[PDB]
Amino acid sequence: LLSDQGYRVDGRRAGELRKIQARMGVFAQADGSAYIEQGNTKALAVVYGPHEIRGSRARALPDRALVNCQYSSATFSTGERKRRPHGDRKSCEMGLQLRQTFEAAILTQLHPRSQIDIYVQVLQADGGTYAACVNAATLAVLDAGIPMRDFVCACSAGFVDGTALADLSHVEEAAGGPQLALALLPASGQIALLEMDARLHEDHLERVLEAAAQAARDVHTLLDRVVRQHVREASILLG
Amino acid sequence: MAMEMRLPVARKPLSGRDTKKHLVVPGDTITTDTGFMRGHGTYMGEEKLIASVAGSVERVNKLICVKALKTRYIGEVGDIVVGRITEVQQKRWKVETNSRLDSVLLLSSMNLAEDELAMRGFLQEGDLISAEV
Amino acid sequence: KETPLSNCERRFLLRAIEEKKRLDGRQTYDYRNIRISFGTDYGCCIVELGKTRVLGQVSCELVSPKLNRATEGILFFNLELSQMAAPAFEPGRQSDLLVKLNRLMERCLRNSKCIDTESLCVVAGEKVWQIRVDLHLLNHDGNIIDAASIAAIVALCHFRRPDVSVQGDEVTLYTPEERDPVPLSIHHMPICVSFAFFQQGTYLLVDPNEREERVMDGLLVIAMNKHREICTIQSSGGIMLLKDQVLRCSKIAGVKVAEITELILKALENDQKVRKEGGKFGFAESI
Amino acid sequence: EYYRRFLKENCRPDGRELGEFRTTTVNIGSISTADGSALVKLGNTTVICGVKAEFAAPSTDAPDKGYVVPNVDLPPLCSSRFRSGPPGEEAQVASQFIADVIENSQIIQKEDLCISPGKLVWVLYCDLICLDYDGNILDACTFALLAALKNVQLPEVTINEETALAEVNLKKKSYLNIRTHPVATSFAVFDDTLLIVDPTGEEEHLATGTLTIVMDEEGKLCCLHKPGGSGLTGAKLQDCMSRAVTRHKEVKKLMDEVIKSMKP
Amino acid sequence: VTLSEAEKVYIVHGVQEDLRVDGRGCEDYRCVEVETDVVSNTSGSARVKLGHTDILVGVKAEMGTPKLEKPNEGYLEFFVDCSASATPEFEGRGGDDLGTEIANTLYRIFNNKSSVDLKTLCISPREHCWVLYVDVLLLECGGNLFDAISIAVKAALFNTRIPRVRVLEDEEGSKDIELSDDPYDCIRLSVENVPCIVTLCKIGYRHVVDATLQEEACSLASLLVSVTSKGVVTCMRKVGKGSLDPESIFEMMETGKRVGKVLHASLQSVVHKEESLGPKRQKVGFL
Amino acid sequence: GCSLRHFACEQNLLSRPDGSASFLQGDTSVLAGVYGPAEVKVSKEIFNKATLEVILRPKIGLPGVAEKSRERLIRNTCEAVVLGTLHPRTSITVVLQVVSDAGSLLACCLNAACMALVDAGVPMRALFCGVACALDSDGTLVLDPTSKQEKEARAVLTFALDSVERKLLMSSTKGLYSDTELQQCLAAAQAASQHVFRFYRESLQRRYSK
Amino acid sequence: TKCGRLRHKEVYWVDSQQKRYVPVKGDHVIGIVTAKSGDIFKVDVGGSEPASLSYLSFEGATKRNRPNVQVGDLIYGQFVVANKDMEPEMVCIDSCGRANGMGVIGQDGLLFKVTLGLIRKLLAPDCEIIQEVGKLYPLEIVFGMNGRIWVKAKTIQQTLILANILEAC
Amino acid sequence: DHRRIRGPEESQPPQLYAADEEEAPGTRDPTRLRPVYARAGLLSQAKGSAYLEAGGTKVLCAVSGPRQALRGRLLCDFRRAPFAGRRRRAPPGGCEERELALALQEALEPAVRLGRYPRAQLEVSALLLEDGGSALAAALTAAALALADAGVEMYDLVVGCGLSLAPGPAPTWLLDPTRLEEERAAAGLTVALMPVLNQVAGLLGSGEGGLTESWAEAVRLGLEGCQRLYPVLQQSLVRAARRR
Amino acid sequence: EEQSFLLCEDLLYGRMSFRGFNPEVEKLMLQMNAKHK
Amino acid sequence: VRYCIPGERLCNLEEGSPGSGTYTRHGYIFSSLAGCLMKLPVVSVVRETE
Amino acid sequence: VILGNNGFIWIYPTPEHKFIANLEPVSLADREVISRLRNCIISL
C-alpha cells in the first residue's frame, strides 16, 4: 500500500515535499560548508574553493577550471554495514554525475588553472540520496562564493496507480519501481540532469516529468529563503 | 588540572538590523538602467544582467557589481600581503596566500651563477614573508 | 596518447551539422547497417553496429544464493574494454568511461526486469543458477552503449542452460550430451538508443561515430521496449535541455526499438533454421 | 659487460667450466612450527619452502580428491628488481610452474588426502619465499618442494559421533607417501648454440634463451619449459636429457644422505 | 613545511614558561563538547567537538558467528574512515593509511577481556552472538586526534542500546527468533571499565598535554597512554619521529594518570546530566 | 597418417588497430589486434630494443595466473622473431581475445599473432607457427587435438616452430611423456609446420589480388 | 622483413598496405600542432614520437616577426633529420631558403586518414582517379606521406562526395 | 586475488579441533635471557643484511640502498612468513603487519640520521620466519644490524627486548618470553633503546591489567635487559666487518 | 641501405590542385610537372 | 688496526677533530659507520668499499 | 601587528633597535600581551 484515498505512507499528498532544513557555514576550518536534511536523510557538503593544483600538475586545463567530486557514504547508513573501500562502483558513478552537474553551471570560465573540489558525505540515507547530495553541494558552493549560473535544485518523483508522487522515501523506492530524479536550474527551465530506472510506459512520461520539475521548483522556493535569511544576518553584523 | 565539558548550546538568531543594503542571490535579475558598463561577480544572460554570487550589490556611476561575503583574496595593485613559501624553483619562489593561485615572487624584485645555488640559503622553504603587490 | 582532433575538423563538422548532413551520407535519423553473427557454442554473439564489433558471452554456474534473496538467481555483468579497441584504452587509465558504461548496462538489464530471475531457483536457499555475462569491446568507432545493449540482449536470447532435475533433495544435473539444454525465460527485449546534442540542444542527432562524439557536447541514452515502454534514461556531458526535446525524443526511440526488435527476431529465426539442417553459425540480417 | 665479453672468454666467469652443476646444500626440518620445512642453498641462491596443513571442503567435481596449493612469492628482500605490493610477473610464472609440475608429475595422489569423502579433506599450502635471488629460481624451488614434502608429517584424524577428531602429540604422526621424484635442470642458451648449465644473474640476463627440463627417475619428462626461442635442434635436446639424468642421480644421492643423517 | 622554524623556537620558548599560544597552562584542556544520540539509524551515536576537530561515532548491532578461539561470548569490531571531508591531502587513498593506524590502536585498547563485559553479548553459545560494529567517522582533523576519538567511543558505547533477543531452537532446522516488543532493552553496557586515551606530547624540557596542530608540528616525539577510571593503565605507545629520554616516560606517565582521573569523572558527570535531562526534551541540535 | 583440421584466416577486420588477424582453426577461434610502433612511458625506455607487450584475455572470467604465463611465452616467442633492434624507444602492443575455445589455444594464438604482426608491418626476420600433438594411453599421436582428444590423452604438447630452418622456438607441456615420444612429436610438428607455412603464403597471395 | 610484391627500378623495394607511419627522412607530411614551448613547438605526425619545429624555420621570420601558428592547426612540411637515434625534426622551407607552398594550410577543409598504399598508388604519374575528379568540378587537395588527406571544395556536399570517393578505394 | 593460485574457499586450523590439554611451562628465573645467534652480511644481492636467531625465534632483514629542508624518508615493510605460527595468515595480511610496520618506522628514525640523504629513500624489509617469542623486538634488532652493515649513517644501534606478564595472583614480570608464555599471558610489553645515548626509541605494549608502578618497573627492567643484551650484537657485527 | 620511398620508385608533386579551382596552386603544380619533365 | 661500531666513542675534542663519517656530542666524538678508523689529528671512520 | 590585505594577521613583538633572525627568547610580559591580542582577533 502506497497511496490510497489520496494519502501516502508518510501522511502527505502527492505534491508536497518533505520538511527540509539547510544550515550554512558549519566548518569554519574549510572554505564552504553546508548541512542539509530532507526528512531523515542527512547530507553534509564541504568545498575547499579555487585552490591551485597541489600535485600531478599535468591535469590542469589552460582555459577553464577543473571540478573534482567525490561521493562517500557512511558505513553505518542503512541496517547492513557496507564498506566504501572495495565497494567503489556505485560511488564512482555518483561522483561522476556530480562532476557533470557542477561542470554544467559553475562558470569554470572565470578560473583558469583552478581546481574546485566538492566533497559530499551522507550521514543517514532515507531515500532520495542523489537530490539531497546535489542540494547540499549547491548550498556549500554558494557558501564559498564561486560564481555560478543559477541556484541548482534536485528532486525525485515516482508513478503509482495513475498518480505522480514527489520526493520519495526509502519505502517508496523499495517496492515501487519507477524512480525519476532530476536536477534543475529554474531561471531558464533547463533540466540539468535526468536519472530514471523503471518500467514506465511512454504515455505517462510527460506527466511525471512535470510533477518532478514542479517538486524541484518547490525546493527552489524554500532554500532561497534560507539563503536570503543567512545573507541578511550577515550584513547586519557588517554595516 | 581541571577539565570541563558542556552540552552544546544551540545558536540564537539574536535579531535590530536596520539595513537597506540591496541583496541578491544567484539567478535573479539586476535592475537595468541603460548606461551601465559591466561588473565582476555577475554575467550577461539573454541580454540581461544576472548576478552570480549571493551577497550585496554596489553601484558606481558606471560600474555595477556584486560584493560577496566570503571569497578568496583577489589581486589588487597597492596592497601589502603576508605569505608562506612553498617551493623553491629556479628563477622564482612560489608563495601561497589565500588567493586562487599560489603567488609568484621573481628573484629580480628581492633586495639582497652567483644566485642559483645561494638562492636556497637566505630564504628558507616554509618561512613567512611580507611584501607589496 | 590518442591523436587530437584538428580545429578545422571541428569547424567543418559543425558546419556540416548546421545543414543536416552527416559524414557518411545517411540522414539524421538512421542507424548504421547492423550485423548479428553467432559463435559455435551457445551464447556467443558478435554484433557489428558498423565498423564497431562487440563480443558477447554468457556463462552460468551453480552458486549458493544471497541470504536476503533466497528464491531467485543472480545476474552478474562485466563490460571490459579490451586493449585493441582504442589506443588510449590502457588498463586502469580509463576508469570513468568504464564505470559510466558498466553502471548503465547493469541498471538497464537488471532493474528493467528483462530476463526472469524467479525461473532460475533450483532449491531455495541451497542451489540456484547464477548467470554471468561478459561483453568485450573490440573496435571503437561509435556508441558502445547501443552495441553493448544489442549484444547483451542477443546473447541472453541465444543462451541455453543445462537441465537439472530436482527429486526431493537430490539435485541431478546432466551433461549437454545427456540432455538438450533448455532456452532461458525472457519477458521482453529492452534496448538502448543514443542521442547526440550539439551546441546547446539546437541540433538532434542519432548514433554518433568517433569524430561525431569528439565534436559533440551532449549525450543522452533512452532505453525502450517492444511494447513501447521506457526502461532507463541517462544524460551525460554537462548539457542543459528543455523537456520538449526529450518528449519528442521518446517517439523516435520507440520507432528505433521496434525496428531493431524486428532485426533480432529475424536473426534468431535464421540461426535456428541454419542449425536445424547440419549445424553452423547463423549469420543475420545486416539491414 | 657484453655478448663478446662473455663469448670471447668461452669459459664461465665464476670459475666453473661447463656442465658444472654448482654447490648445493639442504637443511631439513629447521622451521619447527610448520609441518614441513626445507632450506635450499645453491650457489648463494637461497629458497625456503614451508608446508602448512588445514582442513577444508572438497569440490563437487572432486568429492574425494585433496587440494594442494603452491605459492612462490618474491619479496623485495632478495633483489632490487622486485617491487613492493602485489607479486610481479616472475612470481606468477614460477607459481604456475610449481603448480603444473605438481599436477603433471603426480608426486602425491590426491585420493590419499581424503578424510571423509565429501565432507572434509586435507589442504597442503606450499609457500616458497626466496631469500637471495641470483639465478635459476625454478631448480631451487622444485628441489625445496621435494625436501619439504619429505618433511611432511600428518596426524591421524577420524570423524566420530558428528565430531572430527585429531590427535596431534598422541604419537599418531605418519609420513605422507611420495610416488616419484621430479628434479629440474635449467639451461641458458647463447645464440651461437653454446648452451650452459645453471646461469647466474648477469649470466642469465645477458643471455638470450632459457630452457628447463623436469625429469623423473625412469626417464619420464614432467615438463619441457622453453620460452625465448633463439633456435634449437633436437640433438641438442638429447644432450640436455643426457646431462639431466646425471644431475637427477646426484641430487637423489644428496637428499638420501641428508635424510639418513637426520634419521634420529 | 607547515610552519617556519622561527615560530617553532617562539612556540618552544612559550612552552617552557607555561604560556602557550592561546594562553593555556601546562596541563589544561580546552573546552570539550559532547553530544549524545545524533544519528537516528544506529543503536548508539555520539558527536564530539574539540576546537577545530570533529569526531562522530556510530554503533550498530548485528548477529553473527561468535568465533572459534573464544566460542561462548562476543567481540568488537572497529573501522575508521579518515574521510575526504577533513583535508584534500587525503582524498582517495591516503585516508585508508592513517585510518588504518587509529583502528589498530583501538583493538589494543579493547584487547583486555576486562574492558567491556563480553559475557553480556552472548545469545546462546557457539551459535549466535552479537558483534558491535563501531565506526569512527571524523569530520575535520584539527590536532590531538586520539583523545576525542576515545571520548567519542566512550560516549557512543554509553548510548548503545542493544535489543533483547532470545532464540528458541528445536530438533529441526528451526531458526525462529523472538525479538520481543516493548523497546525497553536493558542490555546497556557497563562502561565504567572502558579506557580513554590521553596524549602527552613533548616539546622541550617540559611535556604538554593536548597539543594543537602547531604544537604537534613543533614537537619531536609523543607518548600515548590509555587510562581507565580507577587506576588501570592499558597499552602505551611512542608516536613520533624523535627520541625520548627515560625519566620523561615516568613523569608523563604520572601526569597521564592524573589527567585520566579528571577526564573520566567529568565525562561520567556530563553524560549523566544528558540522560537526567529531558530525553523527550532538549530538541537535539546539529543545527 | 597425420593431418590438421580445417584452416581459415582473415586479415584487416578491425579499423582502429594497426593490424588485425582472425584465425579459425576447426572450431576454435582467436582474434589478434596489434598496435604498431608507438609511444612508450619513460619507465620502459630500452635504448637497444623495442618493448613488446602481450595481453591475453579469455572470454569467460577475468584473466589469471596461467594466462600471464602464456602471454609471457607469447612475448618471448615474438621478441625472438621480431627484429626489434630496428625500432628503438617504441612500444608494440599485441592484444589477443579468445573468441572460441575448442582446444589447443596456444597454436591458434601464435598463428593469429604471426598474421597480425605480418599485416601490421612490423619488420621480422622470419615467420612462425604453432601446432600441438596429443599422446594417448597407447602412444598414437594426433596433431591438433579436439577438446575430447585433449581430455582423454595422457600428454599434450604445444610447439611453436620457425620458418627458416624449422627449429624449435617455444614448447609447452601437460603430460608425462618420454624422450622418444618427444622426438616423434617434434618430427610430426615439423611436417605440420610445412603445411601451415604453405597456408601462410597462399593467403598472402589471396590478399594482393588488386 | 615484410609481406609485399617485389618491384625493381634502375633498387629493389617491397610495398605493404600498412597504417602506421615510420619517420623517414625527407617526406611531405601533414602534422598537427600539439603545444608550444618557447622557441620550438611540437607537432604530432602519427609516428613514434612527436617532432619539433622552430618558428624561425618558416618563410621570412626572425625574432621581430613571429609566424602565426595556433595550437591545433595542421601544417605541411618535410623532415630534415629522421633516424632511429633521436627524435625527428621537420621544417617548412626549401633547401635554397623559400617556401614552395609549405606552412599553414588554413581552415575549412575536411581532413581524413587513409592507408599508405593508397597514397603510393595515387601519386604515381600514371593515375586514374585524380584526373576524373579534376574533370568533374573545382576543388583542391593536399596529400601527406604519413597517410593523411586534406580536401576543400566550394560547397560541403561536393567535399563529402570527394572524401568518400577518395577513401572508398 | 587473481594474481595468486586460488584453492579451497574456507580452511580451518587443526589445533582448534585438536583435543588436548597443553600444560603451562612452569616457573623460571625472571631475568633469564635466551641465547642469541646473530650474523650480518649473509645475503649477497642486498646491500646489507642480517640474520637473528634466539631460541625458537628467527628473523631476517635486508636493506635496499639509497635511490633517487629536503630529508630522507625510510619506508619500512614488514611481512611475516605465512607459515610462522599455528594459524596460517593470508599472504598479503593487511591488518597486523601495517601495525607492526609503524612500530618499526617510529623506532628507526631516531637511529638513522637523515640530513646526509637529500631526496633519497631507504627500504628496510623485515621477514619473520618463526614466531617463537618476542616478535617485534627481534625484528627491530635485526633491522638495526642490517642497516648498520648496509653502511648508512646512524647515531647508535637499536636494541629491543619484549616483556610479558604471567597472569597469576602475584603478577611477576617475565623477560623475553616464548610463544607459549605469550599464549598464557595477560599483558605483553616491548621496548627498544639506543644504549649509548641512553634514550628510549620506541615502546609498544598491549595491556590486560596493571597499575602505574608495575608498568614503570617493566620499562626499567626492559632497559636493563637491552643494556645487558648489547655486547653479543657488538661482537657479531665486528666479526661481520672482519669478513669484509 | 635507405628506407626512403620517394627516391626509390617515383612520386608526383607537392600540394596537387585541380579545376584551376584555387590559383597559386596551379602554378606550383606546373612547376612540379616541369621538375618531373 | 681496529674496526668500530657506531655507538662507541672514539676520543675527546682535545685529542682529535671530527672529520668524516662521525658526529660530535658534548665532549665526545662518536663514530657513525660500521668499519675501520683512520687518523691535532683528523679521525674518520670509513668502510673498505667506498 | 601586520594586518594583511588578504586573510593573514601577523603579531610580533616590537623591536627597539629600529634581515637577521633575532632568535633570543622574548620576555614573559611581552609574550602574554602578544597572546592577549591573538585571542581578541579570534573573537572578533
Residue numbers in the entry:
A (entry chain B): 6 to 244
B (entry chain H): 1 to 15, 19 to 115, 125 to 145
C (entry chain A): 2 to 288
D (entry chain C): 12 to 275
E (entry chain E): 4 to 290
F (entry chain D): 25 to 234
G (entry chain G): 81 to 90, 99 to 257
H (entry chain F): 4 to 71, 91 to 266
Q: Anything the authors wrote about it?
A:
The eukaryotic RNA exosome is a conserved and versatile ribonuclease complex involved in many RNA quality-control and turnover pathways in both nuclear and cytoplasmic compartments. Proteomic studies of human exosome complexes recently showed that the 9-subunit barrel associates with two distinct yRrp44 orthologues, hDIS3 and hDIS3L, to form nucleoplasmic and cytoplasmic hEXO-10 complexes, respectively.
We engineered a catalytically inactive mutant of human hDIS3 (hDIS3cat Asp146Asn, Asp487Asn) analogous to the previously characterized yRrp44 mutant (yRrp44cat Asp171Asn, Asp551Asn [Bonneau et al., 2009]). From the larger particle population we obtained the structure of human hEXO-10cat-hMPP6 at 3.80 Å resolution and from a smaller one we obtained the structure of hEXO-14cat at 6.25 Å resolution. Similarly to the yeast exosome structure, the corresponding CR3 motif of hDIS3 forms a long β-hairpin wedged between hRRP41-hRRP42. However, the CR3 motif of hDIS3 is twenty-residue shorter and lacks a yRrp41-interacting loop (corresponding to yRrp44 residues 60–67). In the cryo-EM structure, the overall position of the hDIS3 exoribonuclease region on hEXO-9 does not resemble the closed conformation with which yeast yRrp44 binds RNAs entering from the long channel path but rather the open conformation with which yeast Rrp44 binds RNA in the direct access path. When inspecting the reconstructed 3D volume for un-modeled density features, we could observe a tube of density corresponding to a long single-stranded RNA bound in the channel path of hEXO-10. The long RNA channel path in the human exosome is thus formed by the combination of an open conformation of hDIS3 and an apical entry to the exoribonuclease active site.
